[PDB]
Ligand SMILES: *[C@@H]1O[C@H](CO)[C@@H](O[C@@H]2O[C@H](CO)[C@@H](O)[C@H](O)[C@H]2NC(C)=O)[C@H](O)[C@H]1NC(C)=O
Ligand SMILES: *[C@@H]1O[C@H](CO)[C@@H](O[C@@H]2O[C@H](CO)[C@@H](O)[C@H](O)[C@H]2NC(C)=O)[C@H](O)[C@H]1NC(C)=O
Ligand SMILES: *[C@@H]1O[C@H](CO)[C@@H](O[C@@H]2O[C@H](CO)[C@@H](O)[C@H](O)[C@H]2NC(C)=O)[C@H](O)[C@H]1NC(C)=O
Ligand SMILES: *[C@@H]1O[C@H](CO)[C@@H](O)[C@H](O)[C@H]1NC(C)=O
Ligand SMILES: OC[C@H]1CNC[C@@H](O)[C@H]1O
Ligand SMILES: [Ca+2]
């Protein structure tokens with residue numbers, strides 16, 4: 001079949017860019033403590049122009065101290081009157097992105113909120129001005145402390161919006177001189193935001209972009225009618241195998257074709273979280289071993305390149321895009337400066353399945369496509385060619401330049417299945433490369449941290465992935481034997497996105513660990529009612545954190561201890577009395593081998609040969625009984641898998 005590409009009677013919609021999400025939750029957690037040069041190479045693969053993924057857009061979670069899928073992320077306001085714009089790693093990531101690409105688009109979106117915003121209720125719309133104050137302070141802080149211009153602000157990730165809040169947010173933004181900041185809504189479904197915009201004139205004026213999640217390449221009529229920009233503000237979320245790459249390739253094309261969506265943002269940016277956490281390895285690439293330095297430049301990186309390296313925000317789709325007769329699709333974009341980019345995909349059904357949604361079988365076969373260039377695209381003589389084959393795979397390999405010497409302005413390709421072609425008048429394409437990273441090693445079977453860092457670059461010790469609550473470096477200037485510790489700093493349950501545990505917890509190590517000995521110095525700050533624990537064989541985290549089983553060694557300031565099989569403390573292995581009070585350092589040791597475990601207090605056996613379920617595996621962990629202050633020091637673990 002012949003497919004005409006032409007700009008004679010106008011253009012399509014303005015292309016807004018391809019991006020990815022860091023956050024929801026703690027997806028970039030393990031990236032920060034990568035040794036150089038590896039950490040910097042990974043960021044180059046993601047954000048350096050004309051190199052790797054070359055992303056146009058970076059979206060980050062505005063941490064609200066709650067569990068938001070693979071962990072918690074710290075807020076800039078743990079408490080009322082608290083301001084701190086140097087917690088976590090999203091500030092750092094955004095700055096790294098801007099250094100490589102100054103034109104990158106920055107977006108922020110809340111998943112959860114600090115509990116104090118709710119004023120007693122678990123609800124961010126009790127005081128609209130207060131919640132707006134919180135969010136806008138985050139944007140101001142981004143500019144004032146990090147020289148970051150946030151381009152787009154969201155509402156509440158995959159949660160109900162309040163129309164009056166969106167309006168108050170706009171007023172708050174303009175009042176602080178942030179008119180340039182745009183609002184995207186509602187980062188959930190097409191409805192009810194689409195119909196709300198049609199029914200409410202004032203709401204229409206304050207919303208700039210309608211952003212839907214996992215729309216299956218389609219939109220809805222009311223969204224078209226609004227005349228707003230339509231984005232797939234969160235998509236993908238599939239394991240970065242060849243299959244996930246196929247999913248990414250197909251939806252990148254068909255989101256605009258089928259659904260008029262001029263931007264697609266993948267969750268997540270990079271899989272830098274323990275793979276056994278929910279949705280493991282669902283990033284554009286993988287970097288889940290800072291201890292070894294090993295990272296995988298997965299195929300979605302090069303799938304992205306086919307569009308990102310040859311398109312920029314401000315470009316325009318041609319009116320002439322669509323599906324191929326024998327399956328697959330093609331899009332075409334111009335910059336208005338005589339350049340032209342053509343992106344063609346022929347992903348088979350079996351090799352492009354996304355998790356959300358899963359498409360009914362469709363068929364793709366061998367085919368010939370003849371592209372004819374009419375209008376101002378006529379005097380194009382030469383097209384650079386880029387090719388990718390997923391499956392016995394090869395990625396982003398430049399092919400021999402294509403020539404249109406005969407004035408027909410036409411060419412012809414044979415398109416097999418699971419293939420990508422990018423045809424462009426751009427000469428800047430490059431498959432970036434670095435020397436291959438170290439091989440993958442397990443988490444060190446012998447690990448220790450004394451948290452003795454006087455000027456930490458980040459707010460938390462490495463490899464500790466908070467799954468409920470928030471743990472930070474802490475300096476106590478008056479105590480010398482525990483001058484530098486790790487502290488759980490939440491004192492009330494957040495306005496939650498997920499089902500956070502009722503106890504705080506941070507996991508670390510190797511999920512495949514079976515036999516282990518965990519030791520840590522603990523400090524209970526709350527008299528009478530306070531409590532802490534250490535644990536091994538913790539099998540679940542993330543949005544499943546309340547599900548976590550394992551062996552949990554608790555001690556309480558009322559002079560007692562418990563040994564449970566679950567974080568929720570419903571199943572008892574052992575319990576009894578102990579010489580434990582608040583505001584006093586203790587050394588807890590927990591040993592687990594096979595069917596039996598023992599617990600030590602200051603090097604003395606508290607319980608021994610206590611029967612636990614076996615087989616069983618999981619991480620090591622520390623935590624507190626509730627959302628309460630407590631300190632930890634001299635963490636050690638020895639384990640075997
Ligand atoms: C949104 O995109 C759709 C295509 O998915 C446009 O609907 C028509 O699509 C057919 C092909 O199925 C084209 O031949 C028509 O030209 C399209 N309509 C028009 C008016 O051109 C639809 O127009 C788009 N809606 C927008 C841009 O608001
Ligand atoms: C295609 O795009 C390139 C890159 O933007 C254009 O080249 C730029 O042209 C502007 C003037 O319009 C110059 O200021 C830049 O220095 C150029 N950059 C580069 C890298 O060449 C180019 O004009 C466009 N058209 C064609 C036919 O290449
Ligand atoms: C964890 O400890 C258990 C308990 O000792 C180990 O299981 C034993 O392993 C030895 C050596 O292979 C066998 O001779 C025993 O018959 C096993 N007993 C049971 C009850 O399984 C287990 O191998 C250890 N696992 C690791 C990874 O070190
Ligand atoms: C898919 O399409 C080709 C040609 O159109 C046809 O030969 C083939 O049998 C089809 N296969 C299935 C499983 O539908
Ligand atoms: O598919 C999983 C994703 C859905 N949307 C929010 C993300 O945090 C993540 O949970
Ligand atoms: Ca210390």
Ligand code: NI
Pocket residue numbers: 140141144
């Ligand atoms: Ni300021």
Ligand code: NI
Pocket residue numbers: 276511539617
């Ligand atoms: Ni497991």
